[PDB]
Design an enzyme around this catalytic site. Structure first.
Site, PDB file in Angstrom:
ATOM      1  N   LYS A  41       2.562   1.302  -5.850  1.00 27.57           N
ATOM      2  CA  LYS A  41       3.480   0.817  -6.904  1.00 27.57           C
ATOM      3  C   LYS A  41       2.780   0.372  -8.207  1.00 27.57           C
ATOM      4  O   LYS A  41       3.262   0.688  -9.317  1.00 27.57           O
ATOM      5  CB  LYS A  41       4.394  -0.335  -6.368  1.00 27.57           C
ATOM      6  CG  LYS A  41       5.450   0.116  -5.271  1.00 27.57           C
ATOM      7  CD  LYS A  41       6.521  -0.981  -4.888  1.00 27.57           C
ATOM      8  CE  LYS A  41       5.944  -2.162  -4.022  1.00 27.57           C
ATOM      9  NZ  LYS A  41       5.289  -1.726  -2.722  1.00 27.57           N
TER      10      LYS A  41
ATOM     11  N   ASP B  15       0.816  -1.217   0.000  1.00 27.45           N
ATOM     12  CA  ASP B  15       0.000   0.000   0.000  1.00 27.45           C
ATOM     13  C   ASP B  15       0.868   1.296   0.000  1.00 27.45           C
ATOM     14  O   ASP B  15       0.925   2.070   0.984  1.00 27.45           O
ATOM     15  CB  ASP B  15      -1.013   0.011   1.171  1.00 27.45           C
ATOM     16  CG  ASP B  15      -1.884   1.308   1.190  1.00 27.45           C
ATOM     17  OD1 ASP B  15      -2.614   1.591   0.191  1.00 27.45           O
ATOM     18  OD2 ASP B  15      -1.820   2.044   2.214  1.00 27.45           O
TER      19      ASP B  15
HETATM   20  N1  LIG Z   1      -3.821   9.822  -1.810  1.00 23.44           N
HETATM   21  C1  LIG Z   1      -3.152   8.941  -2.683  1.00 23.44           C
HETATM   22  N2  LIG Z   1      -3.585   7.681  -2.823  1.00 23.44           N
HETATM   23  C2  LIG Z   1      -2.861   6.986  -3.742  1.00 23.44           C
HETATM   24  C3  LIG Z   1      -1.738   7.392  -4.511  1.00 23.44           C
HETATM   25  N3  LIG Z   1      -1.269   6.357  -5.326  1.00 23.44           N
HETATM   26  C4  LIG Z   1      -2.087   5.297  -5.056  1.00 23.44           C
HETATM   27  N4  LIG Z   1      -3.078   5.610  -4.080  1.00 23.44           N
HETATM   28  C5  LIG Z   1      -3.905   4.262  -3.882  1.00 23.44           C
HETATM   29  O1  LIG Z   1      -3.106   3.352  -3.035  1.00 23.44           O
HETATM   30  C6  LIG Z   1      -3.564   1.936  -3.117  1.00 23.44           C
HETATM   31  C7  LIG Z   1      -2.446   0.825  -3.308  1.00 23.44           C
HETATM   32  O2  LIG Z   1      -2.221   0.525  -4.699  1.00 23.44           O
HETATM   33  P1  LIG Z   1      -1.017  -0.537  -5.099  1.00 23.44           P
HETATM   34  O3  LIG Z   1      -0.710   0.183  -6.398  1.00 23.44           O
HETATM   35  O4  LIG Z   1      -1.478  -1.990  -5.040  1.00 23.44           O
HETATM   36  O5  LIG Z   1       0.247  -0.684  -4.243  1.00 23.44           O
HETATM   37  P2  LIG Z   1       1.564  -1.469  -4.172  1.00 23.44           P
HETATM   38  O6  LIG Z   1       2.502  -0.401  -3.665  1.00 23.44           O
HETATM   39  O7  LIG Z   1       1.752  -2.147  -5.515  1.00 23.44           O
HETATM   40  C8  LIG Z   1       1.422  -2.870  -3.053  1.00 23.44           C
HETATM   41  P3  LIG Z   1       2.299  -4.460  -3.143  1.00 23.44           P
HETATM   42  O8  LIG Z   1       3.309  -4.131  -2.065  1.00 23.44           O
HETATM   43  O9  LIG Z   1       1.432  -5.644  -2.784  1.00 23.44           O
HETATM   44  O10 LIG Z   1       2.750  -4.670  -4.582  1.00 23.44           O
HETATM   45  C9  LIG Z   1      -4.693   1.991  -4.222  1.00 23.44           C
HETATM   46  O11 LIG Z   1      -5.880   2.338  -3.447  1.00 23.44           O
HETATM   47  C10 LIG Z   1      -4.252   3.276  -5.084  1.00 23.44           C
HETATM   48  O12 LIG Z   1      -5.386   3.795  -5.820  1.00 23.44           O
HETATM   49  C11 LIG Z   1      -1.262   8.773  -4.308  1.00 23.44           C
HETATM   50  O13 LIG Z   1      -0.306   9.305  -4.904  1.00 23.44           O
HETATM   51  N5  LIG Z   1      -2.043   9.438  -3.376  1.00 23.44           N
END
Ligand SMILES: Nc1nc2c(ncn2[C@@H]2O[C@H](COP(=O)(O)OP(=O)(O)CP(=O)(O)O)[C@@H](O)[C@H]2O)c(=O)[nH]1
Ligand SMILES: *C(=O)[C@@H](N)Cc1ccccc1
Lengths: 392, 85, 205, 82, 61
Positions: free
Chosen positions: A24, A21
Site C-alpha cells: 500500500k 505487507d
Molecule cells: N513482488 C512484488 N513486491 C512488491 C510489490 N509492491 C510492493 N512489494 C514490496 O512489499 C513490501 C510492503 O510494503 P508496504 O508498502 O509497507 O505495505 P502496506 O501494504 O502499506 C502495509 P501496512 O498494512 O502496515 O500499511 C515492501 O517490501 C515493497 O517494496 C509488487 O507489486 N510486487
RNA sequence: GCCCGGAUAGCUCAGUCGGUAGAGCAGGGGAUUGAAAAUCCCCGUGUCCUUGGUUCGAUUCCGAGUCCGGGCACCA
RNA sequence: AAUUGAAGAGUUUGAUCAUGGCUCAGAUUGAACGCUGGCGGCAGGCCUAACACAUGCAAGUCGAACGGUAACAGGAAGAAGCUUGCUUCUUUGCUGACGAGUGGCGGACGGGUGAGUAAUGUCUGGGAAACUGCCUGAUGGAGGGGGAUAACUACUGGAAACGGUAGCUAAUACCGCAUAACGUCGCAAGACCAAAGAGGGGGACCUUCGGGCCUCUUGCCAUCGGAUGUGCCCAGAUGGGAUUAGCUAGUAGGUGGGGUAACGGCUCACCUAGGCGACGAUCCCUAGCUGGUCUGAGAGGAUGACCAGCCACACUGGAACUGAGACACGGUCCAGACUCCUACGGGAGGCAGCAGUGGGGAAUAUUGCACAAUGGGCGCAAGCCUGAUGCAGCCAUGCCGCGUGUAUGAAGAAGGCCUUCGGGUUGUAAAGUACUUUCAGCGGGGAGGAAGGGAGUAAAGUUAAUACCUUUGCUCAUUGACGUUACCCGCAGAAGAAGCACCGGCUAACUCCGUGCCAGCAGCCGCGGUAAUACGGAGGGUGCAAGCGUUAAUCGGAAUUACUGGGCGUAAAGCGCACGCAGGCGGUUUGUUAAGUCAGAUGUGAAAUCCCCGGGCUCAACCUGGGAACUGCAUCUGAUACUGGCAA
C-alpha cells in the site's frame, strides 16, 4: 502560505486500505509517479509516506500518511492507512472520509481475517465504494491463481453488503511500476481512469449546518492548534465562530484559518480534506474523536436506541457467547469510547451470529445520529457491526 | 539585516576609506613639525608649520575636523615653536 | 439597578409609610403593618447603634430607589459641595429627574414615574431624557413628548397628585401636561420625618 | 526645528486638539515648550470652541517656528478681519 | 501542607489541585486551603447552600 | 498515535506459573463515666480497576478500555 | 470660591482596672479563583522566563542632483496583413513615468522592555570651559578646470552567500588652483582657509540650430546672532545592613606634553603624600528615577501599572566607523551560545516593534481595517511610506449609567415551612385585569468628525511680460477606516434579561428537620458529647446587584515606632558608678552684624492629575476652559525683637 488553492475540480475522498505487507505505501508512491506525467507532479516516495524513522525499520503504517494527487479530469486526495491488527485504529478513524477507496490484494496473500473486517468496517464507517487492485501480479506464473482468489474477493465484498461483482479489478506489480517499468505503469493509469468513472461524484452536504469530524490535531510552529479532517456538513469561512463539542468539557472556538495540504483555502466547503486553525485553544482542551459543531447545533448524548448485529465465529468475529455487562469500544466515525451493553428482556445470552436489538448507556456524551452507521470492535477482531436507532 | 537602506553600509564603508586617507595625511604633517621640535629647528618647523597650516585648515572645512581641534593645533604648535623662537 | 421586588414588604421592615404603593388604594391596609416584616416579624427588636444607622440609610434608599454604589457617589458629592453635608445630600437626591416627575404628579408611585422617564416620554427643556439619574438644574421646565402625551397613565395619575401635598419648589401647568421647576429644594420643604443626621455618620466609620 | 502643531488629546471619537509649540523630534504629545491655545473640531455651534493666543504665536513665528497646515488654516479661521 | 475543605473529596497520590491562602488554626502546621471546583480537585457532592465556595454549580433542575 | 509500570478490603503490601483472596497497621461496636484514657466482651468491613474469553473451575493465563505516572514519536 | 475635617469592637480574669499583643468592621488594585451573567459608554489589558521564536508587516523617499529605461502606456521612423491606415509589428529614451545604480536627506525621532545602576542616574536650584542638520534674521560670496567610479558590457570564482580582473560614462560624488572677511593663529605685522548648480516661463537678440541671454522659484558657501536639542560642572535631596571599620595607589593635588566640541588624572612623564571616613566611607543585599497613584483628619506610610519627562539595554560580551547627532532595536566588524540552509569548503539569523507561536505561569487580547484625521520622513508639489496614530475585534478587569416593566388585585388560593393544628407565613407576592416599550431583535432614515488639496477661472503682486511664480476669493467633481455609525423613526409582544454572600456575638438579619466530639464549620472568641439559630438541607429574612463572594497585596484602625502624638519605682524598659573628647544646650547688660527667622517682590516650581468655579457628550464616568495650588528652592530690598557670630 503556499499557493492559495483554487476551487476548480470535483473531489472524491479517496484512499488506500487493506492488510499488512500488500505494498500500500510503495504503490501509493507509484500512483503519484504514474500521474506525475498526466498533470503537475507529486511522486511522494516510500520515505515520504512512512516519514517516521521508526516507520522505515518497522516498515508498516503505525500512523497514517495523506498525500494528494490531481488527474487531468478532477481533484483528489489519497489517504494511506494500515492493514495491521494492533495499528488498525489509525485506519479506523481515517476510514470514515472514504466515499471511494482502494483495496490491495497481493497474489501470495489473498483474503485475510483483517482483509475480511477492513471491508466490514467500510459500510459501517460510511465507505460504500471500494476499488480493488490485485497487486504483486508478477509473483506466480499462475494468472488463474489471481482469477480464483478474485472470485473469493468479489464474494468478500458480496457477503458484507457490497455489490462487489461489478468493481473494476486491474492486476499489476507496483514494485516495477514505481521503478520506472512502463509496462506495469499503465495499469494504475487505467485504475485512476475508473475513478473519473464507476464510483461517481459524491453528494456533498455543504448546504447544512456546519459539522467536521476531528481526524487529528497538530501543534504548528507559529500558528498552534490546527484541527485536521475534511468537513462533514455545510461550508465554513475564516471568522465563523463555532464550539468544539464532544466527550470532554465543550467550549466555543473561533475558526481563524483553514488550509488544504498547506494550500490556503478561504471559505472551506463540506468534503475537502483541510486543516483548521483554532483561535486560542490549547493542545490539552482537544481530543481525537470529538467534532467541530456550529454554535449550539447538537448537544451530544449517552443513552440511545441501537440495532446491532453480533458477528458469527465463522466470520472471524466474537468466537463465544456473552453476559449483560460486556464492554466493547463504540466507533462513531472518529470516536473511540467503551459502551456499556444493556440488552432488554427477551434475550440475555447472545451467541456469535445473532441479529439482536438493545440499548447502550455511554460512559460519556458524544455526537449521536439517529441512523449513525457504526462498527462495534473488541481488541483483536471486529466483533460487531450496527447502527444507532434513536437518541434517548 | 536585509534592509533597503543597507546601502548606508556600502555608502559609508566606502566613505570610510576616503575619510581615513585624508585624516592620515593630516596627522603626518602634524607629526612632521614635532620631529623638528625634537631637533630644535626653530625655522624648519616654521616652514613645516606653514606647510600644514592650510592642510589643517582645509580638513577643517571638509566636515572632518570641527575646526577647534584644527584651531588648537594652530594654537599650541605655534606656541611650541615660537616659544623656542 | 431597580429593586423590582415586593414593593410593600419594604414598608414593613422599615416600619414606615413610604408611599411605594401609593396609587389607587390610598391607605395600603393589606400589609398587616408594623408586625409582619417576615416570618418571625412578631418579635420585638432592640435595634442597636449600628442597627439604627443602617436602618436610617435603608429608609432613604428604599424611597428614592437608589442602589448603594450610586448612593455612595451622592454622599461623595454631598461632602465636596458647599453648605451642610446631610442637607446637600437631600439637595442632590431631590433634584433627581424621576423624583421631580413624582413631585410634578406625572405618575402615581415613584417607580411608575421612573418608567415615564425611562421610555422617552418625559422631556425637560425640550430635550428628551431617559436617564432617571438626570440632575435638574434651576430654572428648568419639564414636559412630555407629543407621541406619548395623555395616554391613559399620565391623566389618572395627575388627578391623584391633587390628593396630596403639592410641594413648593415646583409647579405644573397640568393642562398641557407642562411642569416648571423653580428654586433649589429646601430641607424644611421636604419630608422632615426621615433623618439624614444618622446617614452622615454611617459613612464616617 | 521648533514647530506649532496640534497634539490630539480628548477621548475616543471625541478629539480635542492642543495647538502647542514643541520640538519636531518629539511625539504627538511629547515635550513641548509652551502651549498656545486649543482647537475643538467638533464644537460646531456652541459657547466656545477655539482660541489662539496670536501674540505669543507671533513671538515664535519671529523665531521661525514652522506652522503646520491644519494650524495655519485655523489662523485664517480666527481672521484679523473676521 | 493544605487542608482540604468539603464533604467527600476525590483526591489520590498525584491529583493536581489548586491552593489559596488561609490557615485552619486547629491543625498545627496547616496554612493553606485547597480550592474545591478548581483543577483536578473537583467540587463537593450535592450542596445547595454556599456554592460560590466549594465550586458546585447551580442546580440543573 | 505508540511503549512500560501502579490499579489487591481505610492505608500498605504478601499470595500466581489454574484449585472457592490473607496479613500488618487501622479504626470500630457494646459494660462504667458528665464524656473519655485506662480495663473487660467481641471483631475484616473484600466489585483483587472494570468488562470478557481459552474451561469442571481464572487474583493468577491472554487480551481490550479507562484512570495515574513515566518515556518516544507526528507538526495544515 | 480653592483640605467642611478624626467613631470603634472582640479576646488573658471567678470578677476589675491597667499594660500589652492578636483579629474583625472601611477603602483600594495592572488582580486571580468560584458561582453567575442583559446592554451600552469610557479606560485597562504578560506584574512569572530580559525565555526561545515560523510567516506577514513595523522606514523610507527625491527624475526639480545625475548617468540611464529592464518594464508599462502614448508618440515617432518603419512594417505588416487587409476593413491600405483597420490592425499587426521591429525600432525609437523623443515625452509621461519607473525597476536597478550613483548621490542628497531620513535611518540617532517615533515604538518597546525595566535587566543593570545606590551614582557614571533622577528631582531641584545654580554655574561656564561647549556644540547645535533641519527652521529663521542680517551682511557678503556664489570664478575657472581636472581625475576617477557604480550602473553598463566581456570573462569568470562559488551550491548558495558573496564577489574578482580589465575597459565605458555622468553628477548638487570627489579634488586641487583663484578668491576671501567682523573667520582661525598671533601682542601684532603678517600667515592661512570655501563653494553646486538646478527647474519653470519668455519679448527682442542670439542659434556651431545642444544653447547663450532676461527673469522668477529653490538650493549651494562663509561669518555673527537668535531659537531649539544635547554635552559638562557644583550644592541639597535621592533604599535596608555596623554581626561590613577603615578604604584608595591614576589613588589627592601640582608642573609640563597630548587628547575632547567643552574643562578635567580624561590620558601619560616626573614631583609632593595626601583624599575619603562615625554629619557612615568601602563592602553586602535589594531597586529604574520623578511628576504622580492608593490610603490617611493631617503629618506621614506604602508605592510609582496606565499617562508624561529623564535614564538605561537592544541575543551575550566588546569595539569602532559613517554622521550635525549613536559608541546606533529592524547598521558594520570580532568572539560566544543557540537556531537554519549546505554541493559540507562556508554562510544566514536576532519579536525587550505590532500582531502571533511554544513554554513559564493564578493569570492577561486579533497573525483586523485605514492612511480619513493629528504628527513624523522625503520631495517644488501632487503624492508615496508610516503595526506612530486613528479605529475595530477579544475579556465584567475596573469605573459610570440604563434595563430585566408599571398600576391594580384577597379563593386574602395552591404547594412549601412553622404551629399553642387556633393560626401564621410566603404575600399585593403570584394568577387574573388594565396599561408601557428603554435596551435588545427586525424593517427604514440619518448628523458631526473634512481642514484641505486638485482642476479651472478671476483680481491683487512680480517682471521686459497680459507669461511663470506667490497670495486672497469664486465654481465644479468630490477625498471617511470607523459605518450593517451617534442619534431619530417605526413594528411587535410581558415578550430575551437576578443572581450571590451571610444570618451566635463582633455585624444587618430566623426557626424546623436530619447528623450526635462523627460528618463538618472557623477572620478572633470558638461551635459539634442525642433536642446546634455557629454542621448539612428546607422555608424565611438581610445585605450588595450584573455583579456577589474567596485569596493575595498596601494603607487605615495601629497613639502596637508616639515629628504632629507614647513610655522607663513593680506591667517591656535607667548603662553598676564616676571623670570626660566629639556632639547638643546655655544666666544677664550693651553694641554691632543679619547667617538661622519673618515680610514683600522677582526668577523658577513642565503639562496632566488633586482642588475651586464653568462648558460639552440626553446623564455619569469621561473630555475640556480659566484659576488656585505646587506646602520647595535661588536671588534681591528691608525689619532685626529671638538664636547664633565678633567685641566690651
Ligand atoms: N513482488 C512484488 N513486491 C512488491 C510489490 N509492491 C510492493 N512489494 C514490496 O512489499 C513490501 C510492503 O510494503 P508496504 O508498502 O509497507 O505495505 P502496506 O501494504 O502499506 C502495509 P501496512 O498494512 O502496515 O500499511 C515492501 O517490501 C515493497 O517494496 C509488487 O507489486 N510486487
Ligand atoms: C493539511 O494538509 C490538511 N489540509 C489535510 C490533513 C493532513 C493530515 C491529517 C489530516 C488532514
Amino acid at each position: 502560505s503556499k499557493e492559495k488553492f483554487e476551487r476548480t475540480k470535483p473531489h472524491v475522498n479517496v484512499g488506500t486500505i487493506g492488510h499488512v505487507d500488500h505494498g500500500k505505501t510503495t504503490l501509493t508512491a507509484a500512483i503519484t509517479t504514474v500521474l506525475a506525467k498526466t498533470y503537475g507532479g507529486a511522486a511522494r516516495a516510500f520515505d515520504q509516506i512512512d516519514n517516521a524513522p521508526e516507520e522505515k525499520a518497522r516498515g508498516i503504517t503505525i500512523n497514517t500518511s495523506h498525500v494528494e494527487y490531481d488527474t487531468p479530469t478532477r481533484h483528489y486526495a489519497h489517504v494511506d492507512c494500515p492493514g495491521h491488527a494492533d495499528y488498525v485504529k489509525n485506519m479506523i478513524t481515517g476510514a470514515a472520509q472514504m466515499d471511494g477507496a482502494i483495496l490491495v490484494v497481493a497474489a501470495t496473500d489473498g483474503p485475510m481475517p483483517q482483509t475480511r473486517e477492513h471491508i466490514l468496517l467500510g459500510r459501517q464507517v460510511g465507505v460504500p465504494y471500494i476499488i480493488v487492485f490485485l497487486n504483486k501480479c508478477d509473483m506466480v506464473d499462475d494468472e488463474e491463481l489471481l482469477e480464483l482468489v478474485e472470485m473469493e474477493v468479489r464474494e468478500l465484498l458480496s457477503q458484507y453488503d457490497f455489490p462487489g461483482d461489478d468493481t473494476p479489478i486491474v492486476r499489476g506489480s507496483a514494485l516495477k511500476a514505481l521503478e520506472g517499468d512502463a509496462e506495469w505503469e499503465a495499469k494504475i493509469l487505467e485504475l485512476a481512469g475508473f475513478l473519473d468513472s464507476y464510483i461517481p461524484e459524491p453528494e456533498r452536504a455543504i448546504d447544512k449546518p456546519f459539522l467536521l469530524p476531528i481526524e487529528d490535531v497538530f501543534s504548528i510552529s507559529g500558528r498552534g492548534t490546527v484541527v485536521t479532517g475534511r468537513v462533514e456538513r455545510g461550508i465554513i469561512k475564516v471568522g465563523e465562530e463555532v464550539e468544539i463539542v464532544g466527550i470532554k468539557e465543550t467550549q466555543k472556538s473561533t475558526c481563524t484559518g483553514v488550509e488544504m495540504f498547506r494550500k490556503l483555502l478561504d471559505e472551506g466547503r463540506a468534503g475537502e480534506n483541510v486543516g483548521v486553525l483554532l483561535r486560542g485553544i490549547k493542545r490539552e482542551e482537544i481530543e481525537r474523536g470529538q467534532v467541530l459543531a456550529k454554535p449550539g447545533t447538537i448537544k451530544p448524548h449517552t443513552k440511545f436506541e441501537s440495532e446491532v448485529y453480533i458477528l458469527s465465529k465463522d466470520e472471524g468475529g466474537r468466537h463465544t457467547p456473552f453476559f449483560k455487562g460486556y464492554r466493547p469500544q463504540f466507533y462513531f466515525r472518529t470516536t473511540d469510547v467503551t459502551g456499556t451493553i444493556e440488552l432488554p428482556e427477551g434475550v440475555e445470552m447472545v451467541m456469535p451470529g445473532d441479529n439482536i436489538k438493545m440499548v447502550v448507556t455511554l460512559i460519556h456524551p458524544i455526537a449521536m445520529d439517529d441512523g449513525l452507521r457504526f462498527a462495534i470492535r473488541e481488541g483483536g477482531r471486529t466483533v460487531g457491526a450496527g447502527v444507532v436507532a434513536k437518541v434517548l | 539585516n536585509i534592509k533597503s537602506a543597507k546601502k548606508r553600509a556600502i555608502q559609508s564603508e566606502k566613505a570610510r576609506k576616503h575619510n581615513a586617507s585624508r585624516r592620515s595625511m593630516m596627522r603626518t604633517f602634524i607629526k612632521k613639525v614635532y620631529a623638528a621640535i625634537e631637533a630644535g629647528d626653530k625655522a624648519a618647523a616654521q616652514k613645516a608649520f606653514n606647510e600644514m597650516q592650510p592642510i589643517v585648515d582645509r580638513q577643517a572645512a571638509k566636515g572632518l575636523i570641527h575646526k577647534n581641534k584644527a584651531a588648537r593645533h594652530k594654537a599650541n604648535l605655534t606656541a611650541q615653536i615660537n616659544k623656542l623662537a | 439597578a431597580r429593586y423590582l421586588g415586593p414593593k410593600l414588604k419594604l414598608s414593613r421592615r422599615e416600619g414606615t409609610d413610604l408611599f411605594l404603593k401609593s396609587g389607587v388604594r390610598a391607605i395600603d391596609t393589606k400589609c398587616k403593618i408594623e408586625q409582619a416584616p417576615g416570618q418571625h416579624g412578631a418579635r420585638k427588636p432592640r435595634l442597636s447603634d449600628y442597627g439604627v444607622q443602617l436602618r436610617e440609610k435603608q429608609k432613604v434608599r428604599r424611597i428614592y430607589g437608589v442602589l448603594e454604589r450610586q448612593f455612595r457617589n451622592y454622599y461623595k458629592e454631598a461632602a465636596r459641595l458647599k453648605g451642610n453635608t446631610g442637607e446637600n445630600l437631600l439637595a442632590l437626591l431631590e433634584g433627581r429627574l424621576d423624583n421631580v416627575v413624582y413631585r410634578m404628579g406625572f405618575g402615581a408611585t415613584r417607580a411608575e414615574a421612573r418608567q415615564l422617564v425611562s421610555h422617552k416620554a418625559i422631556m425637560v427643556n425640550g430635550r428628551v431624557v431617559n436617564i432617571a439619574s438626570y440632575q435638574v438644574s434651576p430654572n428648568d421646565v419639564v414636559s412630555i413628548r407629543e407621541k406619548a402625551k395623555k395616554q391613559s397613565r399620565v391623566k389618572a395619575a395627575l388627578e391623584l397628585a391633587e390628593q396630596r401635598e403639592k410641594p413648593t419648589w415646583l409647579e405644573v401647568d397640568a393642562g398641557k401636561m407642562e411642569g416648571t421647576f423653580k428654586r433649589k429644594p429646601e430641607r424644611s420643604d421636604l419630608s422632615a420625618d426621615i433623618n439624614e443626621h444618622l446617614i452622615v455618620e454611617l459613612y464616617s466609620k | 526645528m521648533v514647530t506649532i502643531r496640534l497634539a490630539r488629546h480628548g477621548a475616543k471619537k471625541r478629539p480635542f486638539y492642543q495647538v502647542v509649540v514643541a520640538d519636531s523630534r518629539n511625539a504627538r504629545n511629547g515635550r513641548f515648550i509652551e502651549r498656545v491655545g486649543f482647537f475643538n473640531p467638533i464644537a460646531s455651534e456652541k459657547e466656545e470652541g477655539t482660541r489662539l493666543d496670536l501674540d505669543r504665536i507671533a513671538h515664535w513665528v519671529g523665531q521661525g517656528a514652522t506652522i503646520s497646515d491644519r494650524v495655519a488654516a485655523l489662523i485664517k479661521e480666527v481672521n484679523k478681519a473676521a | 501542607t493544605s487542608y482540604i475543605g468539603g464533604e467527600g473529596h476525590n483526591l489520590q497520590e498525584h491529583s493536581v489541585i489548586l491552593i489559596r491562602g488561609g490557615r485552619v488554626k486547629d491543625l498545627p502546621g496547616v496554612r493553606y486551603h485547597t480550592v474545591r471546583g478548581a483543577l483536578d480537585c473537583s467540587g463537593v457532592k450535592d450542596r445547595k447552600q454556599a456554592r460560590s465556595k466549594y465550586g458546585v454549580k447551580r442546580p440543573k433542575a
